[PDB]
Amino acid sequence: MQEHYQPAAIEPAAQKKWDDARISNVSEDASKPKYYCLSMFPYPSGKLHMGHVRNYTIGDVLSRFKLLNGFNVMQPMGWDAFGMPAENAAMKNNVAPAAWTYDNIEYMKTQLKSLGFAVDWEREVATCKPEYYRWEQWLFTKLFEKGIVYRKNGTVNWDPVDQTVLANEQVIDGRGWRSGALIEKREIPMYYFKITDYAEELLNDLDKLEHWPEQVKTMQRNWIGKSRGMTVRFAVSDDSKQGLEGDYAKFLQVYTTRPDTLMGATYVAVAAEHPLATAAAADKPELQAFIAECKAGSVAEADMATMEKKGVPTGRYVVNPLNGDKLEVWIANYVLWGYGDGAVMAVPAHDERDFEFAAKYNLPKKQVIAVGDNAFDANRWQEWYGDKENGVLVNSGDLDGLDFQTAFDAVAAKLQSQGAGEPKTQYRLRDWGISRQRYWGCPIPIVHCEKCGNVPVPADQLPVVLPENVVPDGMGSPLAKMPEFYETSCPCCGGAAKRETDTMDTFIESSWYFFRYMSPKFSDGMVSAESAKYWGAVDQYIGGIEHAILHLLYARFFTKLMRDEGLVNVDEPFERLLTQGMVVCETYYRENDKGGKDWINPADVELTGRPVSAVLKADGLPVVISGTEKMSKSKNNGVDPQELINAYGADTARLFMMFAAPPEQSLEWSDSGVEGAHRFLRRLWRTVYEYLKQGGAVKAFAGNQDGLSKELKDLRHKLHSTTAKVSDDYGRRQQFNTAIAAVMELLNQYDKTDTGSEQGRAVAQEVLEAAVRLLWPIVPHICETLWSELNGAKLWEAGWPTVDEAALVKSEI
Numbered sequence: 098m099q100e101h102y103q104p105a106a107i108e109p110a111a112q113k114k115w116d117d118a119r120i121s122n123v124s125e126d127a128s129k130p131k132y133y134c135l136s137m138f139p140y141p142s143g144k145l146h147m148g149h150v151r152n153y154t155i156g157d158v159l160s161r162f163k164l165l166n167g168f169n170v171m172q173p174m175g176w177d178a179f180g181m182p183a184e185n186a187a188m189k190n191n192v193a194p195a196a197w198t199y200d201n202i203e204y205m206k207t208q209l210k211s212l213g214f215a216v217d218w219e220r221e222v223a224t225c226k227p228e229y230y231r232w233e234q235w236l237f238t239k240l241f242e243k244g245i246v247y248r249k250n251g252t253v254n255w256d257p258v259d260q261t262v263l264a265n266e267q268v269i270d271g272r273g274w275r276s277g278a279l280i281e282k283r284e285i286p287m288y289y290f291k292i293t294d295y296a297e298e299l300l301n302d303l304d305k306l307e308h309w310p311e312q313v314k315t316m317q318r319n320w321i322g323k324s325r326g327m328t329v330r331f332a333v334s335d336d337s338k339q340g341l342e343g344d345y346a347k348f349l350q351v352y353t354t355r356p357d358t359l360m361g362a363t364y365v366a367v368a369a370e371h372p373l374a375t376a377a378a379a380d381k382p383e384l385q386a387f388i389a390e391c392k393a394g395s396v397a398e399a400d401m402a403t404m405e406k407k408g409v410p411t412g413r414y415v416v417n418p419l420n421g422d423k424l425e426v427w428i429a430n431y432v433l434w435g436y437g438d439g440a441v442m443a444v445p446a447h448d449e450r451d452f453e454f455a456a457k458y459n460l461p462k463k464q465v466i467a468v469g470d471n472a473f474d475a476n477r478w479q480e481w482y483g484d485k486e487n488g489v490l491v492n493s494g495d496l497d498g499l500d501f502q503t504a505f506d507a508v509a510a511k512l513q514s515q516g517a518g519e520p521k522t523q524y525r526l527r528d529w530g531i532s533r534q535r536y537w538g539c540p541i542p543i544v545h546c547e548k549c550g551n552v553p554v555p556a557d558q559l560p561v562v563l564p565e566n567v568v569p570d571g572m573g574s575p576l577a578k579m580p581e582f583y584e585t586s587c588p589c590c591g592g593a594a595k596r597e598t599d600t601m602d603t604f605i606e607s608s609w610y611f612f613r614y615m616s617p618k619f620s621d622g623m624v625s626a627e628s629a630k631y632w633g634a635v636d637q638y639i640g641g642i643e644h645a646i647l648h649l650l651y652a653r654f655f656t657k658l659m660r661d662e663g664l665v666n667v668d669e670p671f672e673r674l675l676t677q678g679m680v681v682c683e684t685y686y687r688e689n690d691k692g693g694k695d696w697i698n699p700a701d702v703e704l705t706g707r708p709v710s711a712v713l714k715a716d717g718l719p720v721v722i723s724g725t726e727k728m729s730k731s732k733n734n735g736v737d738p739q740e741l742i743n744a745y746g747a748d749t750a751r752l753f754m755m756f757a758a759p760p761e762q763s764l765e766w767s768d769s770g771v772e773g774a775h776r777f778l779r780r781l782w783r784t785v786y787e788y789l790k791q792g793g794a795v796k797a798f799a800g801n802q803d804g805l806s807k808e809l810k811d812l813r814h815k816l817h818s819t820t821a822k823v824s825d826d827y828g829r830r831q832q833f834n835t836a837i838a839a840v841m842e843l844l845n846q847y848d849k850t851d852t853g854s855e856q857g858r859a860v861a862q863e864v865l866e867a868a869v870r871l872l873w874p875i876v877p878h879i880c881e882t883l884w885s886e887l888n889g890a891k892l893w894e895a896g897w898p899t900v901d902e903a904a905l906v907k908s909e910i
């Protein structure tokens with residue numbers, strides 16, 4: 098055994114040992130209990146970043162822990178390969194997105210292998226290969242026939258200078274983020290998943306997920322946004338009917354979740370597209386301009402609530418069916434056409450947004466709810482104004498004294514008897530629009546025939562292969578400019594026809610890849626029945642919190658679709674969910690000759706104990722140390738994990754990632770922290786080396802410890818206490834930094850114990866054999882090497898250390 102720890106001399110050898118034993122290559126073995134541990138698969142962007150290393154180390158800790166506990170562990174990896182990155186790289190580098198992708202995959206795969214993750218590489222998938230995406234085309238065609246996928250006109254943001262469609266997030270002040278050109282709102286036919294048909298199931302099945310973080314479930318519930326409310330129809334006043342047709346001349350229909358406050362409505366608000374707005378705006382230029390501004394807005398969903406709320410009066414009036422009040426209709430920018438009726442009532446005394454709206458425009462506020470003896474102030478909002486649990490109705494005529502639910506029902510009865518309203522359930526959830534006007538993505542398996550319509554491609558003809566010999570040019574989506582692709586024959590009639598040229602939202606590939614890993618070479622279906630039956634659902638999912646809403650909702654939706662197709666028989670894809678925090682680093686800059694800042698990468702900086710400033714490492718010239726934030730290309734503060742691996746080895750990288758912070762917490766890059774991790778591995782190495790240098794290995798202590806000295810009993814107590822703590826940290830708390838600290842304390846106590854005697858050496862052997870197995874999930878290369886110097890058995894067959902209960906009983910006084 099070499100005296101000094103040298104990662105480059107041990108890490109390739111350990112990886113070859115595991116590869117040869119095929120310990121991570123698993124089959125559907127009915128004799129061993131399955132465990133499916135899955136980390137969110139990466140975009141093959143070029144090289145790993147530190148967020149990747151943290152995610153896949155967490156996954157590997159849990160996977161190796163379960164492996165040592167006797168599970169048949171599947172830990173698969175693959176590549177979320179479609180999307181805009183490869184297209185931008187294509188336009189920047191004049192290479193094919195496919196060529197760029199496959200080169201990146203090969204490089205990043207080598208990186209992952211060098212980190213020693215216990216991955217079943219025989220299950221690798223790449224979502225840009227036709228062997229993968231043919232199956233989501235297949236599912237598309239099956240749901241299209243059932244109407245679960247459908248085609249309808251929708252509105253997109255068109256950038257006329259970049260000649261491409263933009264999401265709301267890429268529209269700034271009504272202009273394209275890169276071009277700076279004014280966006281055009283365009284109506285185009287697009288394809289949608291009817292996810293609203295599954296809203297109730299997606300909402301209610303969240304309650305099954307006892308091992309999901311409560312915040313993720315809360316975010317999903319709020320996104321789905323089910324409400325139990327009331328439809329209410331306000332008769333249009335006789336003087337307000339000019340320009341109105343049909344039922345819009347008879348009544349203004351609204352949806353409210355607070356019909357118990359209907360006696361307190363003081364005005365109503367309609368969307369810019371509402372017929373009442375159209376009729377009112379006919380002779381009023383200010384209304385026309387307000388409507389145009391609303392239609393030209395491109396507010397992203399995450400920003401909708403922060404938008405400043407604005408409105409204009411219409412001079413039109415409706416009548417409250419409960420009390421007979423004549424209320425003025427306003428057009429407001431927060432009322433969205435397509436949500437319910439595109440019209441709401443406003444109760445400023447008991448809804449905070451209505452309070453601020455009415456306070457701005459000096460609209461009336463009428464208290465109809467009282468909470469105890471609390472004072473109502475029409476000039477200042479108080480939280481109890483919105484209370485639904487402990488209020489009773491006041492100023493509400495024959496409804497006074499009722500609580501929320503009782504008043505809800507009485508209003509429902511009153512309105513229904515009059516024909517002026519009825520209870521109604523609504524959902525914020527929109528249908529999922531999947532058409533993308535992009536090249537590097539899964540082709541939509543539809544053929545347009547002037548005789549037959551929009552026709553799904555037959556299953557025998559799938560996949561519709563995306564041609565890979567394409568270099569996007571930036572003057573429009575390439576597929577629409579390639580007749581060699583889109584000119585085809587109709588599969589129903591054989592007539593001249595055109596393939597659909599839009600591609601699929603790349604969320605589609607990540608909505609089912611966890612099932613494909615179960616049988617990634619299965620050519621007769623999305624996933625084979627035998628594999629789906631064996632692996633079931635993902636036992637443990639690990640990924641960033643930024644995916645808590647869309648990706649997880651989409652995956653749960655696809656799981657229920659595939660269940661309803663007979664492909665799987667789980668209701669939920671992921672049993673346990675661990676969401677990791679971001680990785681952050683200090684930033685560095687020098688000021689510009691243009692009064693700005695240029696951001697320097699930390700690897701090109703050297704600091705100069707009490708630290709005082711830093712300078713550029715190539716050419717000494719002091720830079721400004723700046724604030725710490727998420728690693729990004731924006732502030733050029735990304736630390737290349739490859740340089741960390743090159744300088745210290747994979748185990749140091751993994752140990753620092755797991756020790757620096759709990760997974761949910763932000764992990765701050767620290768040079769001293771990395772050095773501390775490496776120093777700890779050197780200490781572990783030296784501890785075993787020095788132990789073996791003073792006598793070589795012995796049989797580890799086991800059994801009755803009567804007659805052991807007090808000092809050795811105390812060390813065995815610490816040993817088996819540490820095993821219990823680490824087991825609980827890996828298995829239950831999923832806090833790995835405290836597990837590492839626990840082993841450090843065991844080694845601290847070992848260091849203070851005289852283990853020179855015969856019984857001392859046996860206990861020392863027991864301590865070291867446990868310590869290297871307790872740390873193997875985190876730093877497997879060094880623990881594999883040290884284990885083999887201590888013991889001739891296969892470490893993974895020795896298994897997870899057991900707690901000796903007898904070592905935890907204390908002497909009787």
Ligand SMILES: CC(C)C[C@H](N)C(=O)NS(=O)(=O)OC[C@H]1OC[C@@H](CCCn2cc(CCc3ccccc3)nn2)[C@H](O)[C@@H]1O
Nearest residue numbers: 137138139140146148152177607640641679680728729735
């Ligand atoms: C299931 C699919 C939908 C997943 C999808 N293909 C995807 O997210 N793929 S992925 O490849 O993006 O990420 C793969 C995983 O691992 C990294 C995590 C980052 C956490 C935040 N995060 C980022 C950073 C730093 C990033 C950075 C660093 C240095 C330079 C430049 C950038 N720190 N924390 C991700 O949430 C995810 O679990």
Ligand SMILES: [Mg+2]
Nearest residue numbers: 304305306307
């Ligand atoms: Mg349960």
Ligand SMILES: [Zn+2]
Nearest residue numbers: 546549587590
């Ligand atoms: Zn046809």
